[PDB]
Swiss-Prot record, chains A, B, C, D, E, F, G:
<keyword id="KW-1015">Disulfide bond</keyword>
<dbReference type="Pfam" id="PF14798">
    <property type="entry name" value="Ca_hom_mod"/>
</dbReference>
<keyword id="KW-1133">Transmembrane helix</keyword>
<keyword id="KW-0813">Transport</keyword>
<feature type="disulfide bond">
    <location>
        <begin position="24"/>
        <end position="126"/>
    </location>
</feature>
<feature type="transmembrane region" description="Helical; Name=S3">
    <location>
        <begin position="66"/>
        <end position="96"/>
    </location>
</feature>
<keyword id="KW-1003">Cell membrane</keyword>
<dbReference type="GO" id="GO:1904669">
    <property type="term" value="P:ATP export"/>
</dbReference>
<dbReference type="GO" id="GO:0070509">
    <property type="term" value="P:calcium ion import"/>
</dbReference>
<comment type="function">
    <text>Pore-forming subunit of Ca(2+) homeostasis modulator channels. Mediates ATP release from astrocytes and ATP-induced Ca(2+) influx in microglia thus regulating neuronal ATP and Ca(2+) homeostasis, synaptic transmission and neuroinflammatory response. May form intercellular gap junctions. The gating mechanism remains unknown.</text>
</comment>
<comment type="subunit">
    <text>Homo-undecamer. Two undecameric hemichannels can assemble in a head-to-head manner to form a gap junction.</text>
</comment>
<dbReference type="GO" id="GO:0048167">
    <property type="term" value="P:regulation of synaptic plasticity"/>
</dbReference>
<dbReference type="GO" id="GO:1903978">
    <property type="term" value="P:regulation of microglial cell activation"/>
</dbReference>
<comment type="similarity">
    <text>Belongs to the CALHM family.</text>
</comment>
<keyword id="KW-0407">Ion channel</keyword>
<dbReference type="GO" id="GO:0005886">
    <property type="term" value="C:plasma membrane"/>
</dbReference>
<feature type="region of interest" description="Hemichannel docking">
    <location>
        <begin position="109"/>
        <end position="116"/>
    </location>
</feature>
Amino acid sequence: NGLVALGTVGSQELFSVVAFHCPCSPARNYLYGLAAIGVPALVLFIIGIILNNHTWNLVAECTFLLLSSILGRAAVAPVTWSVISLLRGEAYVCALSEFVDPSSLTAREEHFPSAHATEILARFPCKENPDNLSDFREEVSRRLRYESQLFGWLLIGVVAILVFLTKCLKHYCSPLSYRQEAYWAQYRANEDQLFQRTAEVHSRVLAANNVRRFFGFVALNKDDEELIANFPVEGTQPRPQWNAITGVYLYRENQGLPLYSRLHKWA
Amino acid sequence: NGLVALGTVGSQELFSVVAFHCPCSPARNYLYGLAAIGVPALVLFIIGIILNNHTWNLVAECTFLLLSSILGRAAVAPVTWSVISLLRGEAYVCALSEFVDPSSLTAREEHFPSAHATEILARFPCKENPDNLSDFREEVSRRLRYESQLFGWLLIGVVAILVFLTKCLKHYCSPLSYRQEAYWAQYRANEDQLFQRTAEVHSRVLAANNVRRFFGFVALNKDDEELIANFPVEGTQPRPQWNAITGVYLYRENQGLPLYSRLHKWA
Amino acid sequence: NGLVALGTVGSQELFSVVAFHCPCSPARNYLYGLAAIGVPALVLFIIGIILNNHTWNLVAECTFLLLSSILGRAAVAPVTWSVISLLRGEAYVCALSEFVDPSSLTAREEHFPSAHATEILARFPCKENPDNLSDFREEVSRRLRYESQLFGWLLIGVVAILVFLTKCLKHYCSPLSYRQEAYWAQYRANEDQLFQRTAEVHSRVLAANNVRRFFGFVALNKDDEELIANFPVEGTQPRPQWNAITGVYLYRENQGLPLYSRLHKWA
Amino acid sequence: NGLVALGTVGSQELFSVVAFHCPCSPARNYLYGLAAIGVPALVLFIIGIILNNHTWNLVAECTFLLLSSILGRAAVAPVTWSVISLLRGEAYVCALSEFVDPSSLTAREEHFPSAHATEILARFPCKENPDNLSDFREEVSRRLRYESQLFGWLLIGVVAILVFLTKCLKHYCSPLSYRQEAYWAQYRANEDQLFQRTAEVHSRVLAANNVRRFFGFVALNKDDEELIANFPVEGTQPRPQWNAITGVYLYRENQGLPLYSRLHKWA
Amino acid sequence: NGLVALGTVGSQELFSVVAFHCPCSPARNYLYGLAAIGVPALVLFIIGIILNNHTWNLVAECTFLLLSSILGRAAVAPVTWSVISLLRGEAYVCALSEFVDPSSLTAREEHFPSAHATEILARFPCKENPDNLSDFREEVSRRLRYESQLFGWLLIGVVAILVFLTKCLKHYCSPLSYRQEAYWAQYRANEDQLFQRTAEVHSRVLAANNVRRFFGFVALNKDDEELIANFPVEGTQPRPQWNAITGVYLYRENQGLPLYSRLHKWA
Amino acid sequence: NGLVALGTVGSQELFSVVAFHCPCSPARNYLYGLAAIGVPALVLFIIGIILNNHTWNLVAECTFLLLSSILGRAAVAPVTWSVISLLRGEAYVCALSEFVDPSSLTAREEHFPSAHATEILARFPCKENPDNLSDFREEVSRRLRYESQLFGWLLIGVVAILVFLTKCLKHYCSPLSYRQEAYWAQYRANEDQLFQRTAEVHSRVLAANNVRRFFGFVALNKDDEELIANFPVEGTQPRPQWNAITGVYLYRENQGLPLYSRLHKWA
Amino acid sequence: NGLVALGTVGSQELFSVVAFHCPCSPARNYLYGLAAIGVPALVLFIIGIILNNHTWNLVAECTFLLLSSILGRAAVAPVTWSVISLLRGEAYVCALSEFVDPSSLTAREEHFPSAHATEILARFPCKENPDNLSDFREEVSRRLRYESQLFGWLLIGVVAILVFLTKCLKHYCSPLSYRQEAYWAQYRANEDQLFQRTAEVHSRVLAANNVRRFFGFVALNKDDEELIANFPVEGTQPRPQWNAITGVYLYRENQGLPLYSRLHKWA
């Protein structure tokens, strides 16, 4: 579970690492903000989609309980980046500074430099402004930062409410109890780990047999020596068996005794 | 019990960590204060609700002795944050500075800059004020900080009185003695821990059996070797048993001999 | 898998290591940028092509599933360099500074130094410009840096989308399941490692026999003493066998039992 | 393989170590650049030729597959020095500064100091130039550095393309497969190492016998005591045998069983 | 082999250690340069001649294959000192500064201080010169340093070419193969070492016998106790035997079996 | 052999340690230089004569092969001091400064302070001279330092040539070979060491016997306990035997078997 | 032998340690120099006389070979102090400054302050002198330091010559050889050490017997327990025996067998 938190720490570090330079300009601020805050979010979303074997299971089968799980396991990375970027400021103020109405803002009482200043307005984040505009721009700076931080806090709140609702609904609308669901999760984890290790060992001993068949002898460590001494092997399982293993498994009950996975259904 | 104190230390650190910038402005101070002090409180409350298995037990059953316990175990995090934010100052003074009556305050004796200064009043926390207003704003600053700290201390006092009353009432209006309640708590803890560990081990050995059935042999460490050598397994319990385990248990007495949990009631 | 990440770290270090000096000049900036950002990319691409034994396997045979795999394993190095060079700036602004239209840019309102300044325009990155042009050049600098960073982020996004599509297509249009593909990968790795080690040992003992035949005795460590004591040898396999081993292997199935490599097909 | 990389690091260190002083002068810059960048290259080439036993094998025999191998193993040292010297600058600009056309270069707009300045042109790298010429010489400096770095990057690219073509051709136009070529390389290495060690031990025991024949006894360590106790010796092989061992060996096949070296052909 | 490299490092250290003070003077610069750069070279040459036992072997006999070997093993020390002194500068410029033609050199355009300045010319390395001559002397300084470094690089190149030619000729015009020459070198080394140690031990035990004959008993360590317990001794070999051992040995072949040294010829 | 090098390092340290103060004066500089550079040389020569047992052997006998050996073993210390003192400067310039001809030297063109300045000439090393004479004295300083260093380098060269000639002559005009001379040297060393140790032990046990005869018992360590337990003693050898041992031994040959020392001649 | 060198190091340290203050004065400088440089010399001479048991041996007997030995072993301490004091300066210049002839010395040409300055002359070492006399006194300072150092070096030379002559004469005019003299020295040392230790042990056991006779038992360590267990004792030797032991022994020969000490003569 801590992998997502490590990824979030890395996301914050990369935020403070790579670069940022607000291109004070009439109409490019909009696009630059949108891209520089969304493209890394999209990349993190893709990364989250990739390393979730549920999607490969699903596409191998080719449902709403699957999409919820996968998108929830994925979207934790883009959200903790969007929030960190909003709360940081200096990325919302860079994109929504041109759109400020120069009529409605109070300061050291002067109307405004002109009716020509829309390219002068959007130049504030680059801190380049005359002394009068210097004392003037703090207002719009603080206002935009205010809007950014408010959106950020509301985003955090909505994400929290959504997570709580998701949990309270998944527990309410599931056929099992919750303790048995914990047992089921432990079983999935243990089965996956044991299957991975056994597959590796079986494959290694098969390869050793193949090589020995060629040279006449195989060179091994003490460990692999034990691995061949204990476990023999003659040939893998047929393709239909592999095909039967893979797939999505919804909880099915044989008579009186439940099954917890497709490999279990292979009893 | 110390997990809540560690969370409180982390809450204080995150308070001093993330950000704060009072948006000196006519009407946004109100909203910004409310959100920036309540949204983290709401998030901490949700987090406290989530990790309290009592709520999942309850919803699995689908009562006032349950809601009190859960909300008490939860609300310790938002309260220790509200108090730290009030006592800190610089968050109440930011939101309730516009509402100060400019007529009723004494200082270096001048009436007030004008009757136009309500946007000049709410600009004090941003420390930007002319020299006369410089010597003037300290009064309202100290007054608002006074109000904040007083509310904070009163909140602490009320929370303490509430906790004491809750304890004195729960002990007065309970069928058991208190020493046996301590025994009951120890039993709940021990039972939960032992059940978790046993579930994990039983599940792992079941998965090992399943994998061996597939490949013809299972690769294991020395520890799991012992785990399979000692404890055999053939199949889990039926779903009705799991359903009988879960649920809320109020103290029920068989004839002469008390039961302390639903799993105990399964004798 | 981490070898590519180590190579990327080394690529960034070498970027910050070797040199860079923007030759402010009318028409050489174009060529210098193109070369100094593409030639290292081409070199990294060649290096990636070289150390991928798939290409030697292929040419030894003398197909679209091979080219995709090889070019994907290769192009990870040039892309992570192109992106680092774009996001860095100071390499796009050096090459596309001459082409800026001197009519369309707003600043401290003066038209432009002359209609003679195209060699004065392309001299900005060398920071040598008069005071008026000093306050003028920041605009074009920021604009070009904006364009560079935008292209960089879009490149990252396109690479991510391409990787995701490649994965989702390779899993959708393959005859096997995905778990068996994992088994197959583990088998390829184990077989390659074991074959390498066995080849080395067999060759060493053969050479020892040859030398002993000459001098009358061979000097060895304790390890090689054991190596000769255990494994004897009389002569290698004929050339047809080596020729049968090499080559590309597409997944072929003997009756009911799959084969996973050409050496396996040598059963 | 890393010996060449260690030699390259040492080459860079010696570049930054020994000296360099551009002799600003009319016609000596040409010669000094040529020598100070080629003579170390020629020395490294000779060194690479020397420590490649293939050349001694060849001359002992007294063919295009030999010359390619030897010159490739050799020229890695001069190329990684030529490239480091070009990319460094301050060695091309020193030699090709006199040949700059004083008519075709734009700067702070003055024609040129005179038509007498060809000895003033070639004095720029020594940084000794009047203030006007000070602001003037930066142009020619940057231009020459540009030319140097471009030639350097193109040299790297051509070397990479040449290496890739060499590999792709040697694998395409060879009678064996590539895995057996790896076996052959391992065999050559193992045979050379074992032969060296055995030769040393046999020679030492022969010398010990000779000395004992003189004094009546030989003084030895425990190690040499074991060396004489185990391996006896009476006399070396005749000169025809040594002559049969040496020489170049192209892959020859006895009936059904391949030979991998001349000593192997001595079966 | 590394002894020569250690001697070269020591030579460089002693160069930077002892002293150097260019005696700015009309005609003494010539002699001082010649001596201070040649006398240490002659000393290193003598030292190299001394510690090469080949010369003592030769004079004990009282041929071109001997002189080449000895002078090659010797001249490595003077050459690596001459080169270090040339490349260093400040030793060629000190001796060949008087001979500069004051007519042919261009600088800040003045003819020359006078036709009396030949003792003013040779005073430049002592850095004592008036301001005009200050800006003047840099030219002759750089020119002489140029000449020195060019001679140095050419010397290195010629030495490298000579070494390569020597090797390629010695391998081409020798009766043996090269591998057997390596065996021969190993044999010479081993024989010399074993003979030295045996001579020492035999001599020590003989001296012990002599002393015991005088006092009636000899005091020894445990080591010498073992040395006398194992190896007895009664008397050395006659002078004709020693005379037969020494001398130069050209490769002679007994019938079918080669001899590798004179002590071997004593079979 | 390294004892002489340690003595040379100590000589250099003592040179830089004790003192030196050039007594600027008309006629005392001569004497002070001569003494302060020769008296330590004479002392080192005497020290070298003392610790060379060959001289005591010779005088005990009461020949040109003895004097050469002794004076060569001795004069290595005064020569390495004379050379270090010449090369150092500031000791030749102190003694031969008065004798400089004030007519023949060129400088800032003035004739000379007077015809009274011979006590002003010899005052230069004490650095006390007026400004004109300040710029004047550097010439004579550098000239005298030049002469000193030249004499030093020539002395080193002559010493090297003399050593080489001595070696080449001693090997050419000796009755033995050179390897047997090495054996002879090893024998002399071993015999001297063993004789010294045996003499010490025999003397100690004799003294122990004498003391025991007086007191009735002798107190000893464990070591001396063993020394008396093993080796008995009754009385030393007569004076004629000691007289026969001492003396110079030229290589004499008994019939067919050589003798290597007088104690050996005592067989 | 190193005890004298340690004493010399201590002498130098005490020289630089205790004090020195030249009493600039007409006639006290003479006496102060004489005393402060001779009295420590006399003390060191007495100390050297005391710790040389030869003198007590001699006076116990109550000859030129004894006085030479004792005075040589003694005078090494005063000489190495006189030399260190002369070479140091600032102790000869303090005593022989009054006697300088004020007529014969050249400086900045003035005759001399007066004919009254003999108390002004001897005040120079106290550095108190007017500016003219300041530039004047350096001459006499350097001259006196010159005289001191010359006397010092001549003293060292004479001491060295005397030591060499003493050695060459003692070896020439002695009845024995020199190797037997070395044996004799070793015997004297061993006999003295063994006699001292035995005397101590015998005395301790005698005292233990005496004490036991008084109390009835003696308390001892383990060591003294062993000392009494092994060696018994009943009574010392008579006074005539002690008288026979002491005395000076010149080398006397019994018939055919030499004696090396008086205790040996007690056989």
